[PDB]
């Protein structure tokens, strides 16, 4: 069973997938393969809650109907400065113009 | 016997027959039975509704007679109806229908009486008027539809519906699902 | 295997390469002689597609890649009305 995620930090967002039965550490492993930072220099969040390295994604809340290809779930990412960690920061996307009245 | 080669031929013949001074309902029925149903020749009038049967007008017949095709789903059926003193012919194009004939009501409400009950096999053509009684037609099949060819002379928009339990009347005005092959909502 | 798509407002979107080739114009860019030489960075700037629609576009990418060979049922791709007009312009440009 596959979940579909956007891993987000600052203005960088990653589109990737994983199995509901794969763990958070395993997810840092592939974030390592993309932005080249080891999992010990990474923090992963679901909204505001830091995620345990050994908890499986299904156990953190990412499941079949919560993280779908056409509507992926969001995973926050924070790196280590080199002493300790930065604050979790994610810039939102832009906003669409207000709906034309011709479309009700 | 005059054997209609096509459905159009049968329609050309009927127009001639109803142009004469006297209509012989034995000869009309015989010639309608004679036409061997060919779906390529009437498929355009075969339109189905999931919930009820459909009335599909084909020819309004120079004001002297109506020609319709009715389309019966699985389990679809008429109500107990009269024919407003007009001749009525029914020919099977596809499937079967069970005709159940009822006698008219005694005046105080009571369950009407089944006089007879018969099945109409394909290409068979029946005749009914108010002189023989009132009927109700249903498609008994659980798996296949029914398609029938109706001729009513004079044409009528009106007739009466009968509660089998009481016999009291409610008179209806009949819709048309299509006219000449075109949907009419 | 991954390529970086950059929006007009500077949002970076890293998606799988074979996902991005869902776009006919991206496939034209990167499958022929426009392929990134290794001395280059795997970045494509879309300087007129804002981030709220570009993010939507990669959602379609994963959707299409996931359900193209599904054989019994697929969901509908949802489009909010506010982004519908802007999304339709990005799809016409991206040819997908």
């Amino acid at each position: 069973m596959d979940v579909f995620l956007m891993i987000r930090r600052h203005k960088t967002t990653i589109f990737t997938d994983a199995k509901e039965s794969s763990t958070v550490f395993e997810l840092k492993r592939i974030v390592e393969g993309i932005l080249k930072r080891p999992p010990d220099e990474q923090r992963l969040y679901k909204d505001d809650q830091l995620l345990d390295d050994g908890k499986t994604l299904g156990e953190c809340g990412f499941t079949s109907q919560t993280a779908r290809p056409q509507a992926p779930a969001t995973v926050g990412l924070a790196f280590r400065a080199d002493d300790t960690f930065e604050a979790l920061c994610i810039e939102p996307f832009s906003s669409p113009p207000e709906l034309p009245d011709v479309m009700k | 016997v005059l054997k209609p080669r096509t459905l159009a031929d049968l329609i050309r013949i009927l127009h001639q027959l109803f142009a004469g001074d006297e209509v012989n309902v034995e000869e009309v029925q015989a010639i309608m039975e004679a036409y061997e149903s060919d779906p390529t020749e009437w498929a355009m009038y075969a339109k189905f509704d999931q919930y009820r049967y459909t009335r599909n007008l084909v020819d309004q017949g120079n004001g002297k007679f109506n020609l319709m095709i009715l389309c019966w789903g699985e389990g679809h059926g008429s109500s107990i109806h009269d024919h407003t003193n007009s001749h009525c012919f029914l020919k099977m194009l596809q499937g079967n229908l069970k005709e159940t004939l009822f006698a008219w009501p005694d005046k105080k409400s009571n369950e009407m009486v089944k006089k007879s009950e018969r099945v109409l096999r394909e290409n068979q053509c029946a005749y009914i008027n108010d002189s023989i009684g009132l009927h109700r037609v249903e498609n008994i099949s659980h798996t296949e539809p029914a398609v029938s060819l109706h001729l009513y002379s004079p044409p009528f928009d009106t007739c009466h519906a009968f509660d089998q339990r009481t016999g009291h009347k409610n008179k209806v005005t009949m819709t048309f699902h299509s006219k000449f092959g075109i949907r009419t909502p | 295997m991954y390529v970086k798509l950059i929006s007009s407002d500077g949002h970076e979107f890293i998606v799988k390469r074979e996902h991005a080739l869902t776009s006919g114009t991206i496939k034209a860019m990167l499958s022929g002689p426009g392929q990134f030489a290794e001395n280059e960075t795997n970045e494509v700037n879309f300087r007129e597609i804002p981030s709220h629609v570009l993010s939507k576009v990669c959602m379609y990418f994963t959707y299409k890649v996931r359900y193209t060979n599904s054989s019994t049922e697929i969901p509908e791709f949802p489009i909010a009305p506010e982004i519908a007009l802007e999304l339709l312009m990005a799809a016409n440009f991206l040819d997908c």
């Binding site: 011709v102 479309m103 | 390529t40 296949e144 | 697929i74 509908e76 007009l85 990005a90 016409n92 040819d95």
Partner: protein
Amino acid sequence: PVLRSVNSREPSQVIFCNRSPRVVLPVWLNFDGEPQPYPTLPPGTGRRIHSYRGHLWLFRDAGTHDGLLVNQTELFVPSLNVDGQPIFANITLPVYTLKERCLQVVRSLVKPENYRRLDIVRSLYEDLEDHPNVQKDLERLTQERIAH
């Protein structure tokens, strides 16, 4: 006309299965090749219907005439019931292009009288007005079969 049902008169029971989120309109192609519609199927519903070997079907959104797939092709022809088992026709969404999916959506929200009041390049006004139609698709499909 090449896309026509053949008058086989050999019956063939069929299961129509709508596993789309749309209201499906079954469309039969008569012996002259003209389309005739049939009762609509709500989402999630299945019905066992009466048909014949060699008859041509296709399936559309009953409200927008968007095209639908049936066993992952757009045309459906039943064979003969081998051993009296039914034939299954599985109606699904296709994976629309993003463009055709947005055009579906904004046709859903703005009346055609007002397409050209939208600030989009006029290349897309004509695209909006090119409403999905089944004889335009028949056009394509017959000329797809001529080129074997």
